[PDB]
Design an enzyme around this catalytic site. Sequence first.
Site, short mmCIF file in Angstrom:
data_model
loop_
_atom_site.label_atom_id
_atom_site.label_comp_id
_atom_site.label_asym_id
_atom_site.label_seq_id
_atom_site.Cartn_x
_atom_site.Cartn_y
_atom_site.Cartn_z
N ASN A 146 -25.90 -18.45 6.67
CA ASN A 146 -26.75 -19.49 6.11
C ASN A 146 -26.18 -19.99 4.79
OD1 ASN A 146 -28.79 -19.06 8.22
ND2 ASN A 146 -29.35 -17.20 7.09
N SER A 190 -27.17 -15.66 2.98
CA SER A 190 -27.70 -14.71 3.93
C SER A 190 -27.06 -14.95 5.30
CB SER A 190 -29.22 -14.84 4.02
OG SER A 190 -29.58 -16.14 4.49
N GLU A 237 -31.67 -19.33 20.13
CA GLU A 237 -31.17 -18.71 18.91
C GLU A 237 -29.78 -18.12 19.10
OE1 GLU A 237 -32.21 -18.75 15.90
OE2 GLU A 237 -34.28 -19.48 16.11
N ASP A 265 -27.48 -20.24 1.86
CA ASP A 265 -27.80 -19.43 0.69
C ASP A 265 -27.04 -18.11 0.65
OD1 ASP A 265 -29.07 -17.96 2.68
OD2 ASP A 265 -31.08 -18.13 1.83
N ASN A 278 -32.94 -12.69 9.85
CA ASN A 278 -32.28 -13.08 8.60
C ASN A 278 -32.23 -11.94 7.59
OD1 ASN A 278 -31.38 -14.44 6.26
ND2 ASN A 278 -32.74 -16.20 6.55
N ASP A 295 -27.81 -14.45 9.73
CA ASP A 295 -28.71 -14.17 10.85
C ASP A 295 -28.01 -13.30 11.90
OD1 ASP A 295 -30.56 -15.88 9.60
OD2 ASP A 295 -30.06 -17.56 10.91
#
Length: 129
Positions: free
Chosen positions: A46, A50, A35, A48, A59, A52
């Site tokens: 991301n 958002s 990750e 959309d 998220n 991380d």
Amino acid sequence: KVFGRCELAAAMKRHGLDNYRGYSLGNWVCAAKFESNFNTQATNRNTDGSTDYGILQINSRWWCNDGRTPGSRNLCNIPCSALLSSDITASVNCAKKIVSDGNGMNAWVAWRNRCKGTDVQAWIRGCRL
Ligand SMILES: [Cl-]
Ligand SMILES: [Cl-]
Ligand code: NA
């Protein structure tokens, strides 16, 4: 902070993640490797809108507040910046809520695609725990 492999394993063990909800320590170290490459300051946006955050790439759509993900939730009740600290406590505490929510570690795409079904104990081999 960029953790060493065994350094992070020991920190995660001393925060209660070994066999938490049945996931052995190697699963958590493997997830963190793919990750974030063990870097607490990692961030990724991301599609959309958002973002991380941190060593486990938690998220902002559901789990933390970053002030720029409209209509999102803050289920861990923390600012997302708290997930970037060299102290992994906030990330671990939030990860415990995520993995308890019904879908286990499948919440982490890199775990599903790169750790699940592999010899995850290799990730803690040689470490003193
Ligand atoms: Cl393991
Ligand atoms: Cl599970
Ligand atoms: Na949020």
